Amino acid sequence: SMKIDVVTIFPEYLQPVRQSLPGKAIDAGLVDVAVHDLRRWTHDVHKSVDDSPYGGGPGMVMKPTVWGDALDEICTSETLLVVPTPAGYPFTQETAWQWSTEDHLVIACGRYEGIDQRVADDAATRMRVREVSIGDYVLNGGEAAALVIIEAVLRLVPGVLSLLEGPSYTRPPSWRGMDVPPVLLSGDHAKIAAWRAEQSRQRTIERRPDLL
Amino acid sequence: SMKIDVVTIFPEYLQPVGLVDVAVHDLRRWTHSVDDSPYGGGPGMVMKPTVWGDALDEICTSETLLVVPTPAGYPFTQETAWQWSTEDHLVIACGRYEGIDQRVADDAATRMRVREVSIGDYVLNGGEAAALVIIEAVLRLVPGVASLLEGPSYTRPPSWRGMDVPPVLLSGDHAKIAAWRAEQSRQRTIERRPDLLGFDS
Ligand SMILES: CN1CCN(Cc2ccc(Cn3ccc4ccc(-c5n[nH]c(N)c5C#N)cc43)cc2)CC1
Ligand SMILES: CN1CCN(Cc2ccc(Cn3ccc4ccc(-c5n[nH]c(N)c5C#N)cc43)cc2)CC1
């Protein structure tokens, strides 16, 4: 039973998450995913969510007052507040396992240069807060990271949906002059696992030597 | 100028997307099941090469960069995004199940450039979420649109819930501000990503 709240100035960007949720997991009450438009908590008629950064520099910073109101309404003390950011701790598979058992996740999606730091600092005095990054590249905002995080976490929730894996093959046995490696049709399953382990080692050495 | 074609059995997931166009293609429009059991055994299903071959035949040219998301890929990083930002034609083949038969990539590599990549060390259900991340990271670099973590940012008001913006940022002194931000960045980097500065995780 997990509730996920996403807060964003582009709620439309989260459409694919609602498209990938099975009706049975929802109706069995295993998961609920709500998306909230941040501008619902703005204070002015211009619906301002950003302002110039103290200290100068390019770009804008999301206003603490607007985010404070949104999180105040949506979070409780039991909430896990996830804040995507290019300067976060790495989001990995272990992170996903750990979060997959939470009752309530709130994902605060920023834009521009990100969110006034006091928002997270304030939230952390009464709930668990995690600033994370989904990888070493730069995005426009937190929304794509939210999709990735939701997908990686939810697929580890029952019934919701070391080395690199080597190549896989299926039918037909021959295709455009390429044969499936004969060892896979040998019926020697110890030897098949050895071949796969060695493909796995070579691939890891070639593509991800850092893991070794 | 860039053309991006994404190929998937779940084009419904890609709905979010002048000098750059992005098209989404339903792989199923090339079937006369897309999946079967893996040779050698194992759990799950593998996408058959036949369907993929026909689809990519029609969409790709020798100039095309074929991008294949996979948990076993080379790391997709900011350097990759820079590299790809000057391509004319990207084709992103999104798999599902346990992935795509290896021969699809091996075949395509005889005719064009192929890049198997991963967007991070976690597991997804398919390549669609990766495609969105790759598209976003690359397109924001397309012409006409160091190795440290950015420190904290603040805006108005200068005091909020009894929390003050660090006084140096209000000081208006650029050299003190640049020094403070430098220190902030390096301390964040060593705390959150020591690997970027060459230490153990
Ligand atoms: C270090 N350098 C130099 C300074 N820049 C400053 C900067 C700051 C924000 C933005 C855009 N943005 C706004 C909210 C937000 C959330 C997550 C992400 C995100 N990007 N990449 C990931 N793995 C992300 C995740 N998760 C990006 C976001 C772009 C550029 C940062 C990089
Ligand atoms: C250790 N091994 C043991 C076996 N499994 C095998 C396996 C293989 C595919 C899938 C799902 N899937 C299908 C197509 C496809 C493309 C990209 C991604 C993807 N995941 N994480 C990234 N950074 C991705 C990217 N980019 C996942 C995909 C799930 C599980 C994996 C872990």
Give the type of residue at A157: V
- φ, ψ dihedrals at B172, nearest 5°: 70, 5
Q: What is the secondary structure of B165-182 as a DSSP string?
A: PPGGGTS--HHHHHHHHH
Pairing state between β B46-47 and B35-36: antiparallel
> How many angstroms separate the CA atoms of B40 and B141, rounded?
43
> How many angstroms separate the CA atoms of B191 and A62, rounded?
24
Show residues of chain B in contact with A65, CB under 8 Å. Answer: 157, 160
Whether B103 sits inside 8 A of A68 (CB atoms) is no
Show residues of chain B in contact with A48, CB under 8 Å. Answer: none
Of A149, A82, A87, A79, residue with least CA distance to A114 = A87
Say how many C-beta atoms besides its own lie within 10 A of residue B201's C-beta.
8
Of B45, B5, B42, B40, residue with least CA distance to B25 = B5
Looking at 3.40.50.720, 3.40.1280.10, 3.30.420.40, 3.30.70.890, the CATH number of the domain B2-140 comes to: 3.40.1280.10
Closest-approach residue (CA) in chain B for A187? B40
Which residues is chain B interrupted after (C–N above 2.5 Å)? 17, 32, 145
Q: Quick one: CATH architecture of A2-155?
A: 3-Layer(aba) Sandwich (3.40)
CA dihedral B142→B143→B146→B152, nearest 10 degrees, is -70
Cα distance from N-terminal residue to C-terminal residue, chain A:
37
Secondary structure string (H, E, C) spanning B74-102:
EECCHHHHHHHCCCCEEEEECCCCCCECH
Cβ contacts of residue A182 below 8 Å, gap of 6+? Answer: none
Indicate which residue's Cα is closest to atom 9 of ligand 2.
B98
- Integer CA distances (angstroms), B185 to A196, B153, B194, B196, in order: 43, 11, 12, 12
- φ, ψ dihedrals at B78, nearest 5°: -60, -30
Give the type of residue at B69: P
Indicate which residue's Cα is closest to atom 19 of ligand 1.
A86
The token pair that represents B194 in the structure block: 């020591």
> Could you tell me the residue ranges of all domains in chain A?
2-155
Q: For A56-170, list the strands marked E by DSSP.
A: 61-62, 80-90, 104-108, 128-133
- Integer CA distances (angstroms), B15 to A22, A134, B24, B125, B141, in order: 18, 21, 9, 18, 22
Cα B69 → chain centroid: 8
Closest-approach residue (CA) in chain B for A93? B122
**Resolution of the solved structure (Å):** 2.2
3-class state of residue A90 by DSSP: strand
> How many angstroms separate the CA atoms of A186 and A17, rounded?
42
The token pair that represents B182 in the structure block: 């430098």
- φ, ψ dihedrals at B43, nearest 5°: -75, 160
Pairing state between β B159-160 and B163-164: antiparallel
Task: Find out whether B30 and B72 touch, Cβ atoms under 8 Å.
Answer: no
Q: Kindly state the DSSP code that residue A91 receives in the 8-state scheme.
A: P
Of A93, A92, A101, A159, residue with least CA distance to A128 = A101
Indicate which residue's Cα is closest to atom 10 of ligand 2.
B98
3-class state of residue B50 by DSSP: helix
Of A63, A117, A170, the CB nearest to B152: A117
* B interface test, pick of A161, A170, A178 with most B CB neighbours within 10 Å: A170
- φ, ψ dihedrals at B36, nearest 5°: -155, 175
> How many angstroms separate the CA atoms of A135 and B116, rounded?
16
DSSP β-bridge partners for residue B35:
B47
Of A68, A80, A85, A90, residue with least CA distance to A4 = A80
CA dihedral B138→B141→B147→B152, nearest 10 degrees, is -100
Task: Find out whether B127 and B95 touch, Cβ atoms under 8 Å.
Answer: yes
**Residue A163 CA, closest ligand 2 atom number:** 1
Classify each residue of B9-33 as buried b or exposed e, where b means 16 or more C-beta atoms within 10 Å of its C-beta: bbbebbebeeeeebebbebeebeee
